[PDB]
Symmetry: D4
Subunit: 208 residues, 8 copies
């Protein structure tokens, strides 16, 4: 079974030092504001489980969404800048997680299953995300084919689908639409599920 009428997913059977998936956007990743939603079905959540992470050479923490024991942490700009939802994490159940960001005044937010879960102001005000980064799902940026691999602790185990990124802050109506029962045909422009190239590596598999 699949969450909202989507017909494809990616399976992480296990968390190891080689498993991850890489995203290749078609247009530059420089952003003034953005939105990014995804579907998750977690098997085991640890001290810090990376869902997706965008990072550059000088700063590996440009954008980062990950799960703690019972909370969702959304990071923009750096570690000190983070927004935390309280007690809205589950295991073995499909759940939708969307979050927006605006650089004009640092408005960031988190929505879980179509309902606001967190919000703050004056986060990374005036910041701009640069180009030339590496976008990944299920793992953080680190050496590949060199060194011991990735940190086995931060990896992800479960299923992912519906990974979309927009170049603007979606309105409330759009955000509730994206999590609906017929929401798998609306895809973002920077990244879209089904049109953008996503290459599983190290053991991740496409499943239909």
């Amino acid at each position: 079974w699949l969450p909202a009428g989507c017909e494809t997913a990616i399976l992480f059977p296990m968390r190891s030092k080689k498993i991850f998936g890489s995203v290749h956007p078609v247009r530059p990743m420089r952003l003034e504001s953005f939105s990014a939603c995804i579907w998750v079905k977690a098997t085991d959540v640890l001290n810090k489980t990376i869902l997706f992470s965008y990072g550059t050479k000088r700063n590996p923490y440009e954008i980062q969404l990950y799960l703690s024991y019972q909370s969702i942490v959304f990071v923009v700009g750096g570690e000190e800048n983070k927004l935390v939802a309280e007690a809205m994490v589950s295991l073995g159940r499909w759940t939708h997680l969307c979050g927006t960001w605006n650089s004009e005044e640092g408005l960031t937010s988190l929505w879980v299953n179509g309902e606001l879960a967190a919000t703050t102001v004056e986060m990374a005000t005036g910041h701009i995300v640069p180009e030339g980064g590496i976008l990944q799902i299920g793992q953080e940026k680190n050496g590949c084919c060199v060194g011991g691999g990735f940190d086995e602790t931060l990896a992800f185990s479960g299923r992912l689908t519906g990974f979309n990124i927009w170049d603007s802050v979606l309105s409330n109506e759009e955000i509730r639409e994206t999590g609906g029962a017929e929401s798998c045909h609306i895809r973002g422009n920077i990244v879209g599920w089904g049109v953008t190239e996503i290459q599983p590596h190290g053991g991740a598999q496409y499943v239909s």
Copy 2:
């Protein structure tokens, strides 16, 4: 679920610079008239989305069928010769397309879901399709193994099945039969679905 009782398809999870599928006919492709049907289910359509393309080194535009928004364009001989349907394609729904051609008087036709959608005369009159070319599905003839790859804009994302080519012009009764509820055992002679060799590349997958 697949249409007309077919039990195999090909999946294009993404449109990238390396994804395509190649067809290897058993007999020469030299033709004076031909017919070609296919089942398609598109995910996203750009200004030009190649379904299948046949071309030699001298002329890469011998035969070509592609989608542009809600229109269907059928090309024989070159760009100047093209037949266009208006609003006969959707997204996320299985649809049957079949095109007809005759070099004796240049009669071309397009049928969508068993109904005539376009017709023309004096198209490539007296022209003979050469032999020894290359036939792909979902991509256009270009540098495949080495180079800059293909143009990602023209690639295809979705599902395809039931790709048949005949060496003659099918009659109206045969054309309506081919899109029937039990038409998946009607295969053409130049190319037949299930007997001819089709090799997905670069990320395309059989869904058998």
Copy 3:
């Protein structure tokens, strides 16, 4: 859907110059009498479609079962020795074939869907099948590691399952049992489905 109770099959999506599957028995193939059954679901039957073939260096035609239009030909020893059944096999439907042989005075027989279809006597009398040959399904003995070589005409396209070989002549009760609705747990000793090693090559797939 699988024929009787089996939960694994092999798919030949296409007939080409590279597709086949090889069988590696655990014990010698030297035999004075044998029985062999199989499930087939043919897509397109040509003038000679090989199902399975056992051949040695000096004689590539030791044992051979194949289809020719709506007829079944069973060969032991050589071409001159063949048993033919008429109007037995159809396309796109699961059917059970099983052949019997005895070297004492050449009793050979063919059963289709549990019913006798042919029988003859004094075939290859006194002949002993040698050992050290190559056993294959869906193709005939020929060079394979030269980029091809296999005759594209004789190959097979469809699904196969339940390939068993016994070292003796099964009785009538056993033969009718092997084609029942709870027969997939009855496996032969020389070759058994799910116990013996079978390696698809060139495009054949397991469709468990």
Copy 4:
């Protein structure tokens, strides 16, 4: 169909000389006591069919669970130390098999489908399982780079799932819970199904 709501398994289509799966625990395997459960569905059982085996360089028989006809043999420390269940395993049916061990004075036991099947005392008393060995499923350590090497007789053919190892002797309530109808979310700490790395080799396949 899979047991206890598990959504993944590993398939052994055959027992060749190269088929096995390797487990890579995160933490050391030095144990004073342990408990290890698994789901199995066997196709054919020989004189000795290995399910999982842990062994070091000096002692290849540190821990071993295997089937012999209709009996289950559990080995800790060597051949002389074995516990045998009489007539409590079948073919083609999912069955749960757990077994605990205590090093304090050698309490070992076997449970089949949540019911005690065997028990003994004073087995490998004072023994400590070393660390730095190799853990495998479906085969015994012989060598994977000798052009094969594994003895085909001992290999396994069927399906496996739910392989967990704990660092302590589970209580009776815990064991009946693990064998329950919704127990697939109860995973052990030394090895857990879905979090620990398991790499099928030589023909074994993940199936969903």
Copy 5:
């Protein structure tokens, strides 16, 4: 032994339907005038033996240098335009071949071993070499990922080294310098030996 003091070459042990080498320039190939030199040691010269070829999708004959028995044919723009030096090639001996082109008035030349061998005027006057094509050595453009494809007759067998391309017509002094005994460090800007990426395919080998 290699000429002019070069430590590397490329070996074509044989001419088949897969052997070639591809060049990946760092800057666009759009040119108004150019020069291009190379070292050859031919084993067997045929009716037409391609040394290097540049071609686009529309026009596969943009630039070509090839050997025809004991002659050298230099092609710019198309097949109709060609310059033929005559009686100035051998087998099994290193030889240097350069040629310049100017689009302002269509001046073309050919130098063999530092001596002018041919010259013409009004060749492809006003023509501009497009950009975005494919550059190769030892073969023509189309025929990859087709199961061979390349014409076995036109391929090359021997050794090549010192392949350089400039963006301007080299003067006479520079041309005589390039074929000197200390010229292997004189590399062009569009393509340079030892700086530009040249990856052999299909059986070609780097040799030192």
Copy 6:
């Protein structure tokens, strides 16, 4: 060091069950008469060491040249037809072996180091070598993709070079020329060294 000024060879470092090299002639192998020479340097000569072998499906012994303990055996048509030299082969020394055949009257001969060593008459008179077989060096025809299969006893260990085949019986002057110190540029038409495709397999290596 290599003989007669040849600059390439093939190394067989070991005789195994997978080592061999395959030849792909451009034109058909149907022959009325032929001549075939080769350079050989043997490391260990066993009861029968294959140099090159041509065989079809129905007759694996069409043409065969191999070495015995101290003799060279040349076979045309079948095992019963063979010509044997007596004491004219050594180990670790380059030696030229050439033999001709004529079907008009069955004249066969063997030359070793430019000197005639054997001759016979009425050998395979009226025979014609079929076409569509497999040509190999260092091994005899047998299954190769099965996984090993080749009999290690008959394999070859050493170095080979200068393998040429003509379509006619070379005269005495040509035969003495082919073994000279400036002969490595004399290549045959059916097969030529450095022009015909010869791809080693299983551990054989090109060496320069």
Copy 7:
């Protein structure tokens, strides 16, 4: 020819987006002072040509040695901390480079061909090089499995050998010894040539 007494090297025939070599030290790279020498023969030096680079996740610029036209730049800690020897490099000639660093007082030095070329004080005083980074030769850490992802401008083209790293500042006598004609047996402890694992990638190859 090799520089002093070494018998292996690594060849970079070209600079592309994939070529580099990775080093796997046996012991941790945490250092308070170090020395590092290398043999280099450059083909083309650009605005910045990386020889070797050590960097962590938070700081890709921990240690760096690279060539800029006719100068040598040695970097410890970050960009602002650099030592620049000037006019001490050529092209196509073997040259020995070695630099030392001390964290107690920030003493850094550069030696070229056994002669001091630069010296500085108060460079990264009190700094400790972290551990758990990635060490590479000929490239900078940017990305491996993202379809290249290496800046082609910074790559290296030429030959390298004798890469050693010590855990202490070598004395003047040791430094002049390391560049001698009998020095290839003097290997460092953190990294040693011929003892430490160095696996080239993307086109680099060992040569001996």
Copy 8:
């Protein structure tokens, strides 16, 4: 340059966790007496550097020869049974090492460069080396693919050639012959250099 006139060797450029070479004898390794000689040229000799090792499942130390700083240790049967020569091995120069064993009275010996270096009596008296073990050069025991790897400490770095094993104790004259300047043509029967299959893995490569 190689010793005694041998054309091939094996290179171990590094000490890693995956480098080794495996030997596949033709006949059983069951022995009551044997001899085994080899040519070695060590780069760095650590506390224990394995040259070759034969071991079975129940006993990984059946036969073992290795270097310990400037000593040579020869092991038959187990750890307690060892013969140690002293000051006999250096670094960077080729040296011949032979050793014989007799089970009748437990006579063991070691020769270095053709001169006796050690001798003992009553070593493994009455012992018989079992059959079905695994023979390797440069590494101790298995773990190649998924065990995690080998112990990098025991690996070997340098060059090896001339590895021969006889089934009997060679006489003194034979032993001095085997280390001569024309000794590369005499090879053992159980294992012979050039006829037996030796397959380098993980980085080792043949060199000529």
